[PDB]
Design an enzyme around this catalytic site. Structure first.
Site, PDB file in Angstrom:
ATOM      1  N   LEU A   3       0.845  -1.185   0.000  1.00 50.52           N
ATOM      2  CA  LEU A   3       0.000   0.000   0.000  1.00 50.52           C
ATOM      3  C   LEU A   3       0.881   1.236   0.000  1.00 50.52           C
ATOM      4  O   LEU A   3       2.064   1.162   0.349  1.00 50.52           O
ATOM      5  CB  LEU A   3      -0.910   0.056   1.220  1.00 50.52           C
ATOM      6  CG  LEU A   3      -2.097  -0.898   1.295  1.00 50.52           C
ATOM      7  CD1 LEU A   3      -1.626  -2.287   1.653  1.00 50.52           C
ATOM      8  CD2 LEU A   3      -3.113  -0.370   2.298  1.00 50.52           C
ATOM      9  N   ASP A   4       0.301   2.359  -0.402  1.00 51.00           N
ATOM     10  CA  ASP A   4       0.869   3.659  -0.101  1.00 51.00           C
ATOM     11  C   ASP A   4       0.271   4.196   1.193  1.00 51.00           C
ATOM     12  O   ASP A   4      -0.648   3.616   1.777  1.00 51.00           O
ATOM     13  CB  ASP A   4       0.606   4.635  -1.245  1.00 51.00           C
ATOM     14  CG  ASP A   4       1.413   4.312  -2.489  1.00 51.00           C
ATOM     15  OD1 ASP A   4       2.518   3.743  -2.357  1.00 51.00           O
ATOM     16  OD2 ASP A   4       0.946   4.631  -3.603  1.00 51.00           O
TER      17      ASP A   4
END
Ligand code: 3PE
Ligand code: 3PE
Lengths: 88, 459, 176, 72, 152, 101, 124, 105, 110, 60
Positions: free
Chosen positions: A42-43
């Site tokens: 994920l960011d």
């Protein structure tokens, strides 16, 4: 008069329920102690996406500095619960 | 009348002739029992006012002030039960031997037929008040106000001592109920015109104008719990009472001469009440409200209409019970937190649920809640002033607009909001400082029901 | 409400907050759901574009200038949840959150009813009295002598000890 | 409790025909399978405003013609 | 409490500013009192005019409902800037244009009444013709003084 | 931005304490010791009957006995009816020539 | 967006919180390391067993003293203060005087003819 | 305004001018019988004779209150006329106002 | 007194049934989930405007009749006639975002 | 009775739906039973008389 008392399993079986609808991560191989940034891809921006569903699931909009900390989905079960005073 | 004070003289040995753990109960017990004896003089079956003795008398103006003065005594005699709890036996008796002298002297004032006996008792009620403040005050500034209370007053009262003597030399007797008959009009002469200031200002020092009132906050804030009751309830009114009396011998030249002090009150009757919005200390807050209200009595006597006196007896006495009430309400918290500030405790009514009902019913006496005697007092005075000039309501209305704010804001920032959970020292309520408030309101509940008693000379 | 906000350690949460605020100031404009689900991804790409720059000047001049635009394009009545600030139910049930010290003022005929609750409470007060100097001592010998102090948020180091300041966080009355 | 996380497909919903206009730009919208519990299941989306302004018109009108022929 | 723990009088001798801020628990550069133009503002700080609304409705203040902690010097006018009376909080619409659409909308909306009172929406009809003269009696009039001449 | 470890036991030890304190639950087994017609045909008796005996005793024998407490308006006479005090019967109204409807 | 003394501009405008500088950032640290010396002294003093009385809050005692007992010791009569201090005490007090005497004189002369035929009044 | 010079400010009968034998408007209800029936002042037209019927039915036929519709039609029709009778005085005064300018030649 | 004593009375049936939320934004299918409140809210809002006999007629009609049948004003008519079609608009807005517009409110059907 | 459902549409308990369907169904009986009878919501029945279409007869 309604809305029975949620106790920690209707959360955990309902948080992980939500994360499986995201379709960009979590291909039915996540878990409850599964961090976001390091072992799911994920960011940080992809994390704000997550908390809003939880916010949209209960209605107690998380402050600015608590989504910064909540990465593991257990930690989400771990903060929802300390506030709503579960485990009577 | 002697029947009423001569027992009050005999409460004074009783304190010194009683053991310490049985003397509060007795001098509390019988002081109520004086009130009944102090209440027979409501037997006014005819207009023939009750002239018992050649020095004493009674009057539908005095008779409330007589009865109120005997009713504040058990009230205040009990409010200082937990104050000065730990101290010497003797001070615990001497404060009572002083707080009874106020009963005796003040009853002798409103009972008086003359002005000198009133005069020497106008000021002999000052020894038992300067002594309460400076010897039992819980603050460093106790002395600066005792000097104020001592010296704002006498500067107005010693010319009064010069005019009363002169009226004797012109007439001979200098009493009421002769001068009201031998009332020869005045010639509007500069010589005959400073006499107004002489025989009017000592009473306008006590009823505080928007000038000299600086003794009114400084004295309350420092008086422990009971040199604020008597200082607001009756002593504050004791100025008004003389102006209903002495203004009879000067009626032609007060049409024009009162336009300053009809007007120095109405303006500052907004200013004080405006200050009353934005004030920190809680005991400094009932004070400024008491100037705004007694400012309406100053602007009552100076119109001389009959309802204006009715609107003064109903506003004086009504203010006398709600004022003395609110001090008990505040000092029911100062005994816990030991601070006068109004923000330190901001979220009660979680802890003092029933006391909040006494703050509420008192605030509504503070403002004008109609089926009552404060609004009846703040209304007939508003009607006289309308007749006086129809542009007073632009002033009298702004105070009503204000007076609904602070008397609510006192309710907001002490009984509504998040509790101050850093106060373990909030004992819920003694049964003793929770009957104090009953001995104020139930009178208003009952005196509201028959205010034929509370009117004055006119009705 | 549980963690302290310090002086913000980076440009990051100044942006992750602007993706939190403005994204919530769009469902108000987009009252429906499918409409809102379209104009959000177009708002996603506006950040996934200009993602990583390394030119901190122009990275801020996109950020600072976002609210020279966002301020004049937000909704006056957004959707703020109940139990959140400003909106209703925020302090509603605070009239009924008494602070739990007041329960040490009852007497028999008031607390002698149910002696079981107070069979616990007395030994909680012992857990608190037998843990205070051992707590302050851990706060005093902490490695926080100098300079920076946000709160230091110290835990109980791994022994039989009871952690730092906890009568706040435990024993705070129950939300509803 | 909590039915299965494989029933909330997009197809047939209005999200279907909203995903095209994002596929025409290429974003794919990771969500919209969570916010899809409201179109396909039970809530078979069709609510035209002439169904609440005159709800109950059928029975009531049918109840009138009785009275319209009860004067006799 | 101590005498030199309470406020003072306009700290000249800038070493006093170094003592005032440590008394008020403030960073020295953050400390500047009122401009000494007479009035009783002594060494007390300025504390820019924030209301107690824009303080965090989040982080769990000590003086909750007032948005302050045990120290952190109180504002002078903290009898309007509490979260009950006045809000200096930001506003989505600027102030000067707020005070233009309001008085602009009213003042126009006032002038449109005057235009209406000149040209009122009157029905093309005459007045009411009452049964008798104008009844004259139950409207108020004595039948000992005159009757009246009017008639349809 | 992710729960440093020393910010994790402070946020867990308080839990097992809170989860325990919050389990100060009221003992459902045993707790405070505490040492139609009949429901409707007595209310009216209690409130609709007995106060009427107190009000009617007040209105019939204090208000009616005072002069102007109870003062009505007139009983709205209309032409073509009699009066139950004198037998006056008032006259009727005249022509009504016609209408069109 | 044009600010004002009210409706003040937010934090997200007004270019503070942007300049992460060595001298602008140290302020926020010691401006906050005093906020943690202090919250600490409250939290350590709040829930201390045997604290029995309240928290004295001296920052509030410095406020009341500043506002009702440190005023006249810091009074210097200037202009902007005495003209400002006479317009406030005598200004309206003289304004209303010429508002009431005119009414009383208007009303009075209207009696002397009878042009103020008094309605059914007893209030005097 | 699509100019109108001056049709009607709002008077009626500045002139009573016209045809010679104009009749007098006639009331039907005697006063003492009518005022003593407590009718109000703003509500008493020449058609106050149909309205005492409207209430002598409403008064006596007190239940089944839907009984006087056949007598409100009698009254309100008479009150539709007087609204029209004055309406003729609008058009009359209008044409008269136009006829007073028609004679300006 | 039979509309606002209904609409609050009928909207508080919503605001307490679901969570304490009380805005049109976050709730939108009250018809199918509540056939009762969505039946009596209409009887309130449809009686609020002008529906030819539902007590927003025996009151309103004689007002809207009298106001445009009298020497009153010009501007105060229009800005009541415009407002007369505005008790329809926001009443058409209650009955659209709450009563139509496929739902939007959190999952738990309490 | 106490039967939440996290998602798919719940049970009706046929007293909300029959009373809700009845209260609304009672309207269009009354509205229509009142429109069949009391159809005076259109001009009344009193024939607004043609403002100026009378040719000066009964004019002075
Ligand atoms: C526990 C206390 C219970 C008290 C009694 C309960 C009933 C209370 C009723 C109160 C209502 C009345 C109050 C006012 C009454 C006033 C009467 C009065 O004082 O007037 C004077 C009167 C004498 O009249 P006078 O004209 O002077 O000449 C009489 C010729 N023989 O004087 C009198 O002779 C009559 C005085 C009556 C006053 C009532 C109050 C009495 C309280 C004081 C006595 C306390 C006794 C304490 C216990 C002693 C030990 C046994
Ligand atoms: C509380 C405020 C309510 C005010 C009304 C008071 C009702 C009681 C009352 O007025 O009765 C007192 C009456 C005395 O009247 P009077 O004729 O002057 O006595 C002659 C003696 N010299 O004497 C009596 O009537 C004695 C008989 C009492 C009978 C029971 C009275 C019941 C009254 C119920 C109606 C009260 C009004 C209700 C409206 C309340 C509004 C707040």
């Amino acid at each position: 008069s309604d809305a029975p008392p949620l106790t920690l399993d209707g959360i955990k079986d309902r948080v992980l329920y939500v994360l499986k609808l995201y379709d960009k991560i979590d291909p039915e191989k996540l878990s409850v102690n599964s961090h976001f940034m390091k072992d799911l891809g994920l960011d940080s921006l992809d994390q704000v996406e997550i908390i809003m569903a939880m916010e949209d699931e209960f209605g107690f909009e998380i402050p600015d500095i608590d989504a910064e900390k909540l990465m593991c989905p257990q930690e989400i079960v771990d903060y929802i619960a300390d506030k709503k005073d579960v485990y009577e | 009348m002697l029947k009423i004070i001569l027992p009050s003289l005999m409460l004074l040995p009783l304190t010194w002739l009683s053991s310490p753990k049985k003397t509060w109960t007795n001098v509390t017990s019988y002081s109520f029992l004086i009130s009944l004896t102090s209440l027979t003089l409501l037997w006014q079956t005819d207009e023939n006012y009750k002239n018992f003795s050649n020095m004493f008398s009674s009057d539908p103006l005095s008779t409330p002030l007589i009865i109120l003065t005997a009713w504040l005594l058990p009230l205040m005699l009990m409010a200082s039960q937990n104050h000065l709890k730990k101290d010497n036996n003797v001070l615990q008796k001497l404060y009572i031997s002083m707080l009874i002298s106020l009963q005796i002297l003040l009853i002798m004032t409103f009972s008086a037929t003359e002005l000198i006996m009133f005069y020497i008792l106008f000021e002999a009620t000052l020894i038992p008040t300067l002594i309460i403040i400076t010897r039992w005050g819980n603050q460093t500034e106790r002395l600066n106000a005792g000097i104020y209370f001592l010296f704002y007053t006498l500067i107005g009262s010693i010319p009064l001592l010069i005019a009363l003597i002169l009226i004797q030399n012109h007439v001979g007797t200098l009493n009421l109920m002769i001068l009201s008959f031998t009332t020869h009009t005045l010639d509007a002469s500069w010589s005959n015109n400073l006499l107004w200031l002489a025989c009017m200002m000592a009473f306008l020092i006590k009823m505080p104008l928007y000038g000299v009132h600086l003794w009114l906050p400084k004295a309350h804030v420092e008086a422990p719990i009971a040199g604020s009751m008597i200082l607001a309830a009756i002593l504050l009114k004791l100025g008004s009472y003389g102006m209903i009396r002495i203004s009879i011998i000067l009626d032609p030249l007060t049409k024009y001469m009162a336009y300053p002090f009809i007007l120095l009150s109405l303006w500052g009757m907004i200013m004080t009440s405006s200050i009353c919005l934005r004030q920190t200390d809680l005991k400094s807050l009932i004070a400024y409200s008491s100037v705004s209200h007694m400012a309406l009595v100053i602007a009552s006597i100076m119109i001389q209409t009959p309802w204006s006196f009715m609107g003064a007896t109903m506003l004086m006495i009504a203010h006398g019970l709600t004022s003395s009430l609110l001090f008990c309400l505040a000092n029911s918290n100062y005994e816990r937190i030991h601070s006068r500030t109004m923000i330190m405790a901001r979220g009660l009514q979680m802890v003092f649920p029933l006391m909040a009902t006494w703050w509420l019913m008192a605030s509504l006496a503070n403002l004008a809640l109609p089926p009552s005697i404060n609004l009846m007092g703040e209304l007939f005075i508003t009607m006289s002033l309308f007749s006086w000039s129809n542009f007073t309501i632009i002033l009298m209305g702004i105070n009503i607009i204000i007076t609904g704010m602070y008397s609510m804001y006192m309710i907001i920032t002490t009984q509504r909001g998040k509790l101050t959970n850093h106060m373990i020292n909030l004992q819920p309520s003694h049964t003793r400082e929770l009957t104090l408030m009953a001995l104020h309101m139930i009178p208003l509940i009952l005196l509201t029901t028959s205010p034929k008693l509370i009117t004055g000379l006119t009705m | 409400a549980f963690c302290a906000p310090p002086a913000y350690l980076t440009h990051q949460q100044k942006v992750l907050r602007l993706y939190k605020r403005a994204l919530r100031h769009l469902e108000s404009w987009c009252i429906h759901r499918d409409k809102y689900r379209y104009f959000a991804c177009l708002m996603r790409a506006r950040f996934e574009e200009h993602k990583n720059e390394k030119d901190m000047m122009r990275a801020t001049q996109l950020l600072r200038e976002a609210e020279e635009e966002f301020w004049q394009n937000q909704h006056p009545q957004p959707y703020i949840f109940p139990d959140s600030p400003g909106g209703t139910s925020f302090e509603r049930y605070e009239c009924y959150k008494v602070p739990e010290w007041c329960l040490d003022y009852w007497h028999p005929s008031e607390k002698a009813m149910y002696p079981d609750y107070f069979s616990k409470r007395e030994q909680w007060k012992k857990l608190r009295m037998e843990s205070w100097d051992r707590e302050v001592k851990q706060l005093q010998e902490e490695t926080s002598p100098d300079g920076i102090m946000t709160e230091a948020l110290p835990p109980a180091r791994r022994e039989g000890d009871l952690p730092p300041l906890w009568w706040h966080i435990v024993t705070r009355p129950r939300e509803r | 409790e909590l039915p299965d996380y494989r029933q909330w497909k997009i197809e047939g919903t209005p999200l279907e025909t909203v995903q095209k206009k994002l596929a025409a730009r290429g974003l794919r919208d990771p969500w919209a399978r969570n916010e899809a519990w409201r179109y396909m299941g039970g809530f078979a989306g069709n609510i035209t405003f002439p169904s609440v302004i005159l709800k109950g018109f059928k029975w009531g009108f049918a109840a009138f013609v009785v009275a319209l022929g009860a004067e006799y | 409490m101590t005498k030199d723990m309470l406020p003072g009088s306009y700290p000249r001798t800038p070493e006093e500013r170094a003592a005032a801020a440590k008394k008020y628990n403030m960073r020295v550069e953050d400390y500047e009192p009122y401009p000494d133009d007479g009035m009783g503002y002594g060494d007390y700080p300025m504390l820019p005019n924030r209301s107690q609304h824009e303080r965090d409705p989040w982080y769990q203040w000590d003086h909750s409902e007032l948005r302050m902690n045990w120290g952190e010097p109180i504002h002078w006018d903290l009898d309007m800037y509490i979260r009950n009376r006045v809000d200096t909080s930001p506003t989505p619409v600027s102030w000067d244009v707020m005070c233009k659409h309001l008085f602009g909308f009213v003042a126009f909306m006032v002038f449109m009444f005057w235009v209406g009172h000149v040209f009122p929406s009157y029905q093309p009809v005459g007045p009411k013709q009452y049964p008798y003269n104008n009844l004259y009696l139950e409207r108020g009039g004595d039948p000992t003084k005159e009757p009246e001449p009017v008639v349809h | 931005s992710g729960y440093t470890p020393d910010e994790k036991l402070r946020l867990q030890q308080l839990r097992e304490l809170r989860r325990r304190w919050l389990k100060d639950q009221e003992l459902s087994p045993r707790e405070p010791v505490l040492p139609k017609a009949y429901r409707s045909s007595l209310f009216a008796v209690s409130h609709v009957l007995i106060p009427m005996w107190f009000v009617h005793y007040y209105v019939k024998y204090h208000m009616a006995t005072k002069p102007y407490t109870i003062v009505s308006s007139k009983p709205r006479i209309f032409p073509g009816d009699t009066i139950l005090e004198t037998g006056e019967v008032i006259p009727p109204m005249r022509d009504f020539p016609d209408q069109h409807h | 967006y044009k600010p004002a003394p009210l409706a003040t501009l937010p934090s997200t405008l007004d270019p503070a919180e942007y300049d992460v500088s060595p001298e602008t950032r140290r302020a926020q640290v010691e401006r906050l390391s005093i906020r943690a010396r202090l919250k600490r002294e409250y939290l350590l003093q709040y829930n201390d067993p045997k604290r029995v009385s309240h928290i004295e809050d001296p920052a509030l005692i410095r406020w009341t003293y500043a506002r009702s007992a440190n005023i006249y010791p810091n009074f210097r009569p200037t202009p902007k203060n005495s003209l400002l201090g006479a317009v406030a005490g005598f200004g309206p007090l003289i304004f209303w005087y010429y508002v009431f005497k005119t009414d009383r004189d208007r009303k009075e002369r209207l009696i002397q003819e009878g042009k103020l035929d008094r309605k059914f009044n007893i209030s005097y | 305004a699509s100019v109108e010079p001056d049709p009607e400010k709002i008077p009626s009968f500045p002139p009573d001018l016209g045809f010679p034998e104009r009749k007098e408007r006639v009331m039907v209800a005697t006063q003492q019988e009518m005022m003593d029936a407590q009718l109000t002042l703003q509500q008493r037209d020449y058609c106050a004779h149909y309205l005492i019927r409207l209430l002598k039915c409403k008064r006596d036929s007190f239940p089944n209150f839907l009984a006087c519709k056949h007598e409100q039609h009698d009254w309100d029709y008479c009150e539709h006329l007087d609204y029209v009778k004055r309406m003729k005085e609008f058009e009359r005064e209008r044409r008269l106002l136009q006829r007073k300018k028609r004679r300006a030649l | 007194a039979f509309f606002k004593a209904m609409l609050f009375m009928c909207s508080g049936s919503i605001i307490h049934s679901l969570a304490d939320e009380q805005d049109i934004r976050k709730m939108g299918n009250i018809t199918k989930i509540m056939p009762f409140t969505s039946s009596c809210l209409v009887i309130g809002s449809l009686a609020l405007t002008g529906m030819p006999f539902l007590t927003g007629f025996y009151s309103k009609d004689l007002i809207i009749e009298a106001i445009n049948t009298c020497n009153t004003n010009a501007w105060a008519l229009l800005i009541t006639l415009i407002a007369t079609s505005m008790t329809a608009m926001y009443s058409m807005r209650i009955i659209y975002f709450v009563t139509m517009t496929k739902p939007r409110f959190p999952p738990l059907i309490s | 009775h106490i039967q939440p459902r996290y998602r798919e549409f719940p049970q009706l308990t046929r007293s909300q739906v029959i009373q809700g369907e009845f209260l609304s169904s009672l309207m269009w009986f009354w509205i229509l039973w009142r429109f069949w009878h009391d159809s005076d919501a259109v001009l009344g029945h009193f024939s607004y008389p043609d403002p100026s279409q009378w040719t000066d007869e009964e004019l002075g």
